[PDB]
Amino acid sequence: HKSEVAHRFKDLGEENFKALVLIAFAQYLQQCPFEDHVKLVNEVTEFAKTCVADESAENCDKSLHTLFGDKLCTVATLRETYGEMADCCAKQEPERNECFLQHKDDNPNLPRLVRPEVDVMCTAFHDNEETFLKKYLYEIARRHPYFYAPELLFFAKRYKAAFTECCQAADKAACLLPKLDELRDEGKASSAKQRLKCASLQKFGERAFKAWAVARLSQRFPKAEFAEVSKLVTDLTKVHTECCHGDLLECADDRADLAKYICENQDSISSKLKECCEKPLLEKSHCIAEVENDEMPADLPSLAADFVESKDVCKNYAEAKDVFLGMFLYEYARRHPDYSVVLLLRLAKTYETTLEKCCAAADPHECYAKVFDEFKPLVEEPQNLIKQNCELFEQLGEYKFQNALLVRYTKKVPQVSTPTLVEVSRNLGKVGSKCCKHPEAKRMPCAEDYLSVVLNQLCVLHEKTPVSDRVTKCCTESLVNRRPCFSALEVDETYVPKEFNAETFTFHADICTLSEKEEQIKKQTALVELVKHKPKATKEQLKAVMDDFAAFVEKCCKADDKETCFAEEGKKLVAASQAALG
Template sequence: MKWVTFISCLFLLSFTESKYLSRAYREAEPPTTIKHVSVLSDEHLEKICLVLFSQFIQKGTHEEVHKLVEDTLALAKKCTADEHSDVECTKPLSTVLLDEICHEEGIAAKYGFAPCCAQADLERHECFLAHKNGSRYYISPFPKLDPEATCKQFHDKKVEALNHYIYEAARRQPFTKIVTFLHGEKEYEEVLTECCQVEDKHACFDDKVAAATKRMLKAIGVEKHQCSVLRKFGMESLQGLKIAQMSQKFPKTNFQTIKDISGKIGHIYEECCRGDTLDCMLDRKKLTDYVCSHQDTLSSKLKHCCEGPILERGECIAHAENDDKPADLSPTVREFIDDQAVCQHYAENKGVHLAKFLCEYSRRHDELAPVMLLRLAKGYEEMLEKCCATEHPVTCLQEGEQLLNKHFAESTAIVKANCDLYKQLGSYLFQNEIIVRYGRKAPQLTSDKIRALTRRMVGVAADCCHLDGAHRVACAENHVDLALGFLCYLNEQHPVNKQVGKCCDTYTKRRECFIGLGPDPDYVPVPFNTEIVHFHADYCTAKPEEQQEKKQIMLFHIIQHKPDISEEQLATAIVDFTDVVTNCCSKENKEECFNTEIPKLIERTKAALGEQ
């Protein structure tokens, strides 16, 4: 609750004005009509409409969606030639798209949109957004590609094949940015171009398509995480992250501009997170246009982005290198510590003072992750509350500064220790270590979910541990933030336990909270399931990844059965199990060996755990 109070204080005053100015500006400006998007190529307009219709009519067939797209493209050509030729030409683009759905015979009734179509424009739009369903099994899982059939379609009807990919992806992710699908489709085309030319198409598909899918799902995961921050902790928290990010990206830019850009980004996320992906795209383009038209004062690293294709500029800017720091930028923010008037500034306008601290600290420390910068800002706010009530606040603040430095040193040490362990053990054994670590904290998770969580933790190490010290910490903070966000998402769907829920109720201190957790004190251990441990002969001929999965399921079950098992007891059980499996897989009659030796192994394990 204290964190919510802090972040609200931090940004409520500083963003209220720009928030309402933005809304008034949007209402005053002319709507984006179908003619306004004629600056895009027919191909891009077709893909944008395809994404939007697929996200609205998620259970519609590809043929039904294609018909709506074709009708919209025909209207676009008509309006471009003569904007007075049809009443639809002057309507907002979002209205035109919903008109197409509502006027298409049978579509509205077939998919439950008739009540929406009976409403006035704004209410109709809200009704359509409310129908979007992002749950995992609302649409059947993405169909597995048949390499031969896919390559034949790609060769014979390339555009249709790529459009079908967009359709299948977009209808499963109705809250995802349009540009994410366009980038994914571009990668998909590159993969098919390569794989359809090689002899072993199956191997190429297994490798390249899986990698491209993983990258796209990762991008979608980042978007969902930002939306979860917005949903659970409010707009102020999301804008706080953006202030930190924009201060790092544009270190020469003044505070007011950083604040305004961050506010606009927050509004864009608000649109996408509620499923309004068209306005999200249009407002993102407006912000991109603003940034590119002011790049001389914002950053020297944007030229190549602003000269690129219209729809790619926003993503390019988001991932662009941080600009060089001003030559005259002081290395520290002493005015927030040593100034005798610091408590007066804080008392006069807490929100602005804390936001300026975050901005100034962030522009000097591009090696720190935004979530860590927010954590430091929270620490600074706590210092002010404590020190400004004392007789000598400056002396107190200087002492508190040492605590902030100590916190960063501790974070660096934790990352180094985990990276050292990852390099020593390798991916598989490191994942086992994390399964044990988080299995104790959250034994109520299923084996599938604990493995999904710990795969993300291994991904943190794989992506970050090869970087230099400073960048390694920032990378790890960002990636762990996503991984713990996934755990908290699981907790939202099905509460894990009280201590996990408590950690998820914080944001900036989430990582520290999880690190400090021990075994769940309220957990009732599950009975020992001999079937999970009883391996059979087919294990010996299984693929390595299948063998690893089975062993990890067994490992997690042991933790679920005895969360307080000692490291020594666990190591003994693992060595004993490994010896039995190695021995039985070398025998001619493997099944007989497993049937004989596994029961003995189970008895030895129970005895070692003091259960006999």
């Protein structure tokens, strides 16, 4: 109303307000120390309480961007510490805010945040819960200037919970550690997905984004009408554009509106928004965005009616190509919550191509009549890979399943670095253990979501150090063809094996004391290097060495004079193996 800070203060609450202001400042002034930001927060909070009291008090009328900018320009060491950015303070709003956005460092040169010992961690938490959580909130926020603030706040509260439950536990570590690792990945995944959607919106444009949304929104709100889905898709697009531009406030307002709009028309969108809509202003958005798919209508016509038979296909299609295709997408997506969004896009793409070729032919109907048949092979491809890979994972464990993927890809792309291969394969394996446990109907969507992030990470590392044209093709290809492209890679015939290296296969007793995580990465690293040396080795030849090795270790780690065993038997292993693998 009259006062913006007052309004936000009232909605959000004191605690949330103070946390968000902190995150916001940490995201711009990434270089200032924790104690400086805390001061800022206090002053902004105090000022806020002043306005809550008297809406007409000094400055309370000024907009949030203006207020935020002024306080930002208050920092005396602004130029000394941030140089160029200080020139932003000379500009008027909105150039000022705009200027600040352009100077936000997407990834500064800060030190990796290390995880302390669980005990020091639980004691710090206990002795000063607030400064312990806020300082870490600060460290995370400054390292991820683009992470949507409210969401970072959502994570914080889960972290708080993990410490309460675990620092009380008998075995604190057994409780805490795994919850922490889970929190980290979930954080890594959210981060990666946010930057991924933004990248895509930049490269492939609005249209492509819109398409992806119709599909996703349709699977989620199958009982909504195409007109509502269009509405939502338009607003969602605006939201992402702005949220991607990086302006927290604008992004927040857009999201608030959309969430409240959805809740008001809740009855005509989805029957699973009841809970989400009764939640606090700060959680509405987050909830809705993650809502389970609603139940789809039972009395739903067959597609071929309006899209294959009907002689108005080309008529309706030429009258508004994108709308018609959007309708096709809507119709197909809502009957298939079990398809990955990108699979749906491939079908829509296929349908479009057909109509382009066909509607330009004498007898349209005859030309495009056998299209739903062209879909079959498209749908089955992803399904087959799922059942096939999920079975294999059920046999061997995650670990053993990770090794198979290790051999499989080292062969396809031997140029890639051994460490990169180990990491990608490990994360790929995890997708197997996180998705294969769901009933079929949810597998593909799961794989898509986890595969998309892992594939982007893969492409990035490669952007930096290009090592293969094939990998770069897949990486730059259509986002809808990214995964298929990687799936179509075959063994590298050209590759010339790395010259043998003794050190690379020498193992010491230190291997017996390392943690599982460590031992595995140690073994998996030799494996990639093994394959990189003998790429023509068969499943049989390999399993042989591995079995020998397997024993080797266990044997030399349960016998006196370790380092002797590994050195004496080690020579034997390598000697025999070099021979078996000719």
